[PDB]
Design a protein around this ligand. Structure first.
Ligand SMILES: *[C@@H]1O[C@H](CO)[C@@H](O[C@@H]2O[C@H](CO)[C@@H](O)[C@H](O)[C@H]2NC(C)=O)[C@H](O)[C@H]1NC(C)=O
Ligand SMILES: *[C@@H]1O[C@H](CO)[C@@H](O[C@@H]2O[C@H](CO)[C@@H](O)[C@H](O)[C@H]2NC(C)=O)[C@H](O)[C@H]1NC(C)=O
Ligand SMILES: *[C@@H]1O[C@H](CO)[C@@H](O)[C@H](O)[C@H]1NC(C)=O
Ligand SMILES: *[C@@H]1O[C@H](CO)[C@@H](O)[C@H](O)[C@H]1NC(C)=O
Ligand SMILES: *[C@@H]1O[C@H](CO)[C@@H](O)[C@H](O)[C@H]1NC(C)=O
Ligand SMILES: *[C@@H]1O[C@H](CO)[C@@H](O)[C@H](O)[C@H]1NC(C)=O
Ligand SMILES: *[C@@H]1O[C@H](CO)[C@@H](O)[C@H](O)[C@H]1NC(C)=O
Lengths: 99, 66, 50, 113, 38, 280, 33, 99
C-alpha cells in the first residue's frame, strides 16, 4: 500500500469508464437497451419515443461522467501544482518551510 | 395597423413575432433580405413589409431588482 | 452506428460538442501537468562516469 | 451488430454461444453452423486531427488518425495513431506541435520527429 | 463504443530522462542549476 | 410543331472545374461581419462540371436528370439561351414546368404539355404541340467574345421551386473565370410537382439554320455544409467547403477563416461495413 | 524620480494618459480583446 | 500569444454564453424551438407536452452552463489565491522560495 495514491487515481478512472459503458446496458424505461432491436421491432413513430428515452438516459450518463472527470481533473491539477512547487522548492533548492 | 417606434411593443412582421423596441436602423439591407441576425442568431434587424425601411429591434430593458 | 439516433440527437444541439470540448481540455491539461512538474530544466545534465 | 471477426483462442463450453467482457459487450461468438469461436473486435474508431501551421505561413496540413493502424486507413505509424502527410525525420528538435507518444510535428513541408 | 485512450505526450522514458537530468543537476551543481547556469 | 435537327456533329461532352462557384444565399436573412455555418444543398468546390457548347455544327440540347438540384452556368452573348424544360416524363401523361423568355417577357407555366423531341426557338435576320390541363401561370419581368455570365440554381424543396440567379460582366474568351460571386435568390415558385429531368432551350439563327456562339455548364447540388463569410455590408465574400480538404474542415470546425499553428481534432474516422453476414 | 539611476517609467502611472495607467498596463489592456 | 491565459478565460466565458444562447434554437425533440409557434399551432393538451420538452431541454442546458461555470470558478479562485500569495510574497517582500 505504499503507492496507493497513484493506484486510487488509476482505479477511479477505470471504474468511471466501466460505469459509463455499463450505462449503455440500461434501457432507461424503454423496451430495450439495444437500438438495433428497436429499429428492427418497431415502426418509426414509436421508435422515435424509444430512442428518445435511450438518448436522454445515455446523455445524462455521459454528462455525469464528464462532470466527475472535470472535478477529478481539478483535484489532479491541484496535486500537480503542488508537485511542481515541491520540485522547484525541494529539489532545485533548500526549503525553510516546515514539513 | 399603424407602426409605432421607440417603444417596447409586440411586433408581428410577416409571421415573425416578438417583443422589442423598434428604432431606426443605419444597416442597409440588400433588396432580397428581410430579417437581420447578430452573431448569436437572434433577430436584431428587420424590414417593414409595407414600406421598405430597416428597423433595429433592441430587446426591452429587462433587469434584476436588488 | 444508427443514423436515426444521430438525427434525433441533432435536435438536442451542441451538448456533444460541449462534452468533447471538456474532455479535450482535460486531455491537454494532463500533458500540461506533466510538463509543469518534470520539465523544469532546459538542459539535460549528466553525472560524471566516476 | 457490426465488427471485425477474427479466429479466437477462447474455449467455450458446449452450452455457450456468445461471450461478454467486463463491460458486458459481446467480444466472442460461436458460429451456429461450424462450431468455432470468433473474436468480435469493434471496427476501428479514430479521432481525425489536422496538424497545420498558421495560414499566414502555409496551407499544408497533415492528418492524424488517433489510435488507428496505418494498414486500415508520407505515411508514418506512431503510437498515437497513423500520421499522413508528415515526413518522418531522424533528427530531434524542440516540440512545436504535439502529436503524442514523444512525437511532435513542425514546419520547415511538415515534418514529424 | 466511442471510447479512446490518448497516449501522453511525454513517454515514461522521457520523464525518466527529465528526472535523471534533475538528479544530475542537484548532485553535481547543487541548487545553482535551478537559478541559472550549473 | 416539331422539327428534327439532323445536321449535328458528334462530339463527346466536355468537363471542367467548378472552382469556388455555385454559392447562393441559403435564406432571406441579413448577416453582418459574421461567419455562418449552414447545411444545405450546395455545389461542391473544385468539382467536375459538365460543359456543353453551341458553336458552328454543335447544338447541345439533351435531357438530363435533375437530381436534388441544378447549377446552370452560362457564358452567353446575343441571348441564345431562352429557357428551360422541367418535368419527369416530358409528355402529356404527367405535368411539366415550362420556363421561357421570348422577346417581351418571361413566362412560367405548370401544365400538361406535349414536348417535342428537339425543342428550340428561332431568330430570322417549335417547342410544343399541345397544352391540355394548366394549374399555374406566372408572367414576370425579364431576368436577362462572351460578354455575359449567368449563374442559376434550381431547387425542388417541399414542393417549392427556388430559382437563384446572378449576372456577371466578364471578358474571358473560353472557360469559367476564377472568382467569388454569391447568387441572390430571385424567385420561389409554389409548384408542388415532381421534377426529375430538365432540358435547355436554345434559339436558332436563320439567314438551313445556324447555332449562335454560347457555352453552358451543368453542376449537381449535394447536401453539405458551407462556412459563409458576411462582411460589414452583408454580402457573402468568401466561403469554406467543410468536406473538401482537412484544412477547410478545420476552418469549418473552428468557425474561422484563419487557423493558428497547432493540432485540432476535427472529425472522427469510422470504417464502413463492406458486407452483411447472416449466420442461422 | 531620483532612484540612483533606476528607471520605473514603464511601470509607474503615466500622467499624460487619462486612464492613469502605466505604459506596460496600457499595452496589456490594449492586447486583451 | 503572450497574454493567452487571460484571453482563454475571456474566450471561455464568451463561448459558454454563446452556447447557452444557441441552445434556445434547439427543439429538443419538440415540433419547434419557438414557444409562440407551439402555442399558436397546437391545442393546450399537446402544446403542454411540446412546451415540457422545450422546458426540460433548456433546463438541462442551463444546469450544464451553471455546472461548468462553477468548475471554472473553482479554477479561477485557485489562480486568484496563487496571485494573492505572489502579491504578498514577491511584491511585499523578498522570497527565498525557488521559482
Ligand atoms: C423527331 O425525332 C424523334 C425521335 O425519332 C421522333 O419521335 C418518334 O416519333 C415516332 C413517330 O411515329 C414515334 O413512333 C417514336 O416513338 C418517337 N420516338 C420517341 C423516342 O418517342 C419525332 O417524331 C421526330 N419529329 C418529327 C416532327 O418527326
Ligand atoms: C526613463 O525611461 C524613459 C523611457 O525609457 C526615458 O524617456 C525617454 O527620454 C529620452 C530622452 O530624454 C527620449 O528621447 C525618449 O523618447 C523617452 N522615451 C519615452 C518612452 O518617453 C527617460 O528619460 C528615463 N529617465 C528618467 C529620469 O525618467
Ligand atoms: C471529369 O470527368 C471526366 C469523365 O466523366 C474525366 O475524364 C475527367 O478527368 C474529370 N475531370 C476531373 C477534373 O476530375
Ligand atoms: C411572348 O409570350 C407571351 C406568352 O407566351 C405572349 O403573350 C407574347 O405575345 C410573346 N411575345 C412574343 C414577341 O412572341
Ligand atoms: C386532362 O386533359 C385531358 C385531355 O385534355 C382530359 O381528358 C382530362 O379530363 C384532364 N384532366 C383534368 C384533371 O382536368
Ligand atoms: C418522382 O418521379 C420519379 C421518376 O419518375 C419517381 O421515381 C418518384 O417516385 C416520383 N416521386 C413521387 C413523390 O411521385
Ligand atoms: C461597404 O459599403 C460602403 C458604402 O456603403 C463602402 O464605402 C465600403 O467600401 C464597403 N465595404 C466593402 C468591403 O466593400
Amino acid at each position: 500500500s505504499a503507492l496507493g495514491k497513484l493506484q486510487n487515481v488509476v482505479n477511479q478512472n477505470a471504474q468511471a469508464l466501466n460505469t459509463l459503458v455499463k450505462q449503455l446496458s440500461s434501457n432507461f424505461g424503454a423496451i430495450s437497451s439495444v437500438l438495433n432491436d428497436i429499429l428492427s421491432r418497431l415502426d418509426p413513430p414509436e421508435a422515435e419515443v424509444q430512442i428518445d428515452r435511450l438518448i436522454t438516459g445515455r446523455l445524462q450518463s455521459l454528462q455525469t461522467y464528464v462532470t466527475q472527470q472535470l472535478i477529478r481533473a481539478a483535484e489532479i491539477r491541484a496535486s500537480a501544482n503542488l508537485a511542481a512547487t515541491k520540485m522547484s522548492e525541494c529539489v532545485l533548492g533548500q526549503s525553510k518551510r516546515v514539513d | 395597423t399603424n407602426l409605432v417606434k421607440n417603444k417596447c411593443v409586440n411586433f408581428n412582421f410577416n409571421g415573425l413575432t416578438g417583443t422589442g423596441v423598434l428604432t431606426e436602423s443605419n444597416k442597409k439591407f440588400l433588396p432580397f433580405q428581410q430579417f437581420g441576425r447578430d452573431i448569436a442568431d437572434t433577430t436584431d434587424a428587420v424590414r417593414d413589409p409595407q414600406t421598405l425601411e430597416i428597423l433595429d429591434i433592441t430587446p426591452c430593458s429587462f433587469g434584476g431588482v436588488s | 452506428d444508427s443514423t436515426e439516433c444521430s438525427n434525433l440527437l441533432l435536435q438536442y444541439g451542441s451538448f456533444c460538442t460541449q462534452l468533447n470540448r471538456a474532455l479535450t481540455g482535460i486531455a491537454v491539461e494532463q500533458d500540461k501537468n506533466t510538463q509543469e512538474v518534470f520539465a523544469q530544466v532546459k538542459q539535460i545534465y549528466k553525472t560524471p562516469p566516476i | 451488430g457490426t465488427g471485425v471477426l477474427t479466429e479466437s483462442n477462447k474455449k467455450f463450453l458446449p452450452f455457450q454461444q456468445f461471450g461478454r467482457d467486463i463491460a458486458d459487450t459481446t467480444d466472442a461468438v460461436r458460429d451456429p453452423q461450424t462450431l468455432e469461436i470468433l473474436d468480435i473486435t469493434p471496427c476501428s474508431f479514430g479521432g481525425v486531427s489536422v496538424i497545420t501551421p498558421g495560414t499566414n505561413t502555409s496551407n499544408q496540413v497533415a492528418v492524424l488518425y488517433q489510435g488507428v493502424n496505418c494498414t486500415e486507413v508520407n505515411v508514418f505509424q506512431t503510437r498515437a495513431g497513423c500520421l499522413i502527410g508528415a515526413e518522418h525525420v531522424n533528427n530531434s528538435y524542440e516540440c512545436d506541435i504535439p502529436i503524442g507518444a514523444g512525437i511532435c510535428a513542425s514546419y520547415q513541408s511538415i515534418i514529424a520527429y | 463504443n466511442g471510447l479512446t485512450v490518448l497516449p501522453p505526450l511525454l513517454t515514461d522514458e522521457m520523464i525518466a530522462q527529465y528526472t535523471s537530468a534533475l538528479l544530475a543537476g542537484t548532485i553535481t551543481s547543487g541548487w545553482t542549476f535551478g537559478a541559472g547556469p550549473a | 410543331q416539331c422539327v428534327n435537327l439532323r445536321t449535328r456533329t458528334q462530339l463527346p461532352p466536355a468537363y471542367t472545374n467548378s472552382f469556388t462557384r455555385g454559392v447562393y444565399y441559403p435564406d432571406k436573412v441579413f448577416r453582418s461581419s459574421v461567419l455562418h455555418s449552414t447545411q444545405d444543398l450546395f455545389l461542391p468546390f473544385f468539382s467536375n462540371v459538365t460543359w456543353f457548347h453551341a458553336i458552328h455544327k454543335r447544338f447541345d440540347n439533351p435531357v438530363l436528370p435533375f437530381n436534388d438540384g441544378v447549377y446552370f452556368a452560362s457564358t452567353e452573348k446575343s441571348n441564345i439561351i431562352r429557357g428551360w424544360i422541367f418535368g419527369t416524363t416530358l409528355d402529356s401523361k404527367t405535368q411539366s414546368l415550362l420556363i421561357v423568355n421570348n422577346a417581351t417577357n418571361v413566362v412560367i407555366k405548370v401544365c400538361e404539355f406535349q414536348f417535342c423531341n428537339d425543342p428550340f426557338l428561332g431568330v430570322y435576320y417549335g417547342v410544343y404541340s399541345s397544352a391540355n390541363n394548366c394549374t399555374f401561370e406566372y408572367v414576370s419581368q425579364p431576368f436577362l467574345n462572351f460578354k455575359n455570365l449567368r449563374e442559376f440554381v434550381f431547387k425542388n424543396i417541399d414542393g417549392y421551386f427556388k430559382i437563384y440567379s446572378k449576372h456577371t460582366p466578364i471578358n474571358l474568351v473560353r472557360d469559367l473565370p476564377q472568382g467569388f460571386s454569391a447568387l441572390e435568390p430571385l424567385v420561389d415558385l409554389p409548384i408542388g410537382i415532381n421534377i426529375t429531368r430538365f432540358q435547355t432551350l436554345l434559339a436558332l439563327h436563320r439567314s438551313g439554320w445556324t447555332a449562335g456562339a454560347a457555352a453552358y455548364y451543368v453542376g449537381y447540388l449535394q447536401p453539405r455544409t458551407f462556412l459563409l463569410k458576411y462582411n460589414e455590408n452583408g454580402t457573402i465574400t468568401d466561403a469554406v467547403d467543410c468536406a473538401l480538404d482537412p484544412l477547410s474542415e478545420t476552418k469549418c470546425t473552428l468557425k474561422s477563416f484563419t487557423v493558428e499553428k497547432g493540432i485540432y481534432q476535427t472529425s472522427n474516422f469510422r470504417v464502413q461495413p463492406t458486407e452483411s453476414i447472416v449466420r442461422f | 524620480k531620483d532612484f540612483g539611476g533606476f528607471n520605473f517609467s514603464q511601470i509607474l502611472p503615466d500622467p499624460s494618459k487619462p486612464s492613469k495607467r502605466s505604459p506596460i498596463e496600457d499595452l496589456l489592456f490594449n492586447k486583451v480583446t
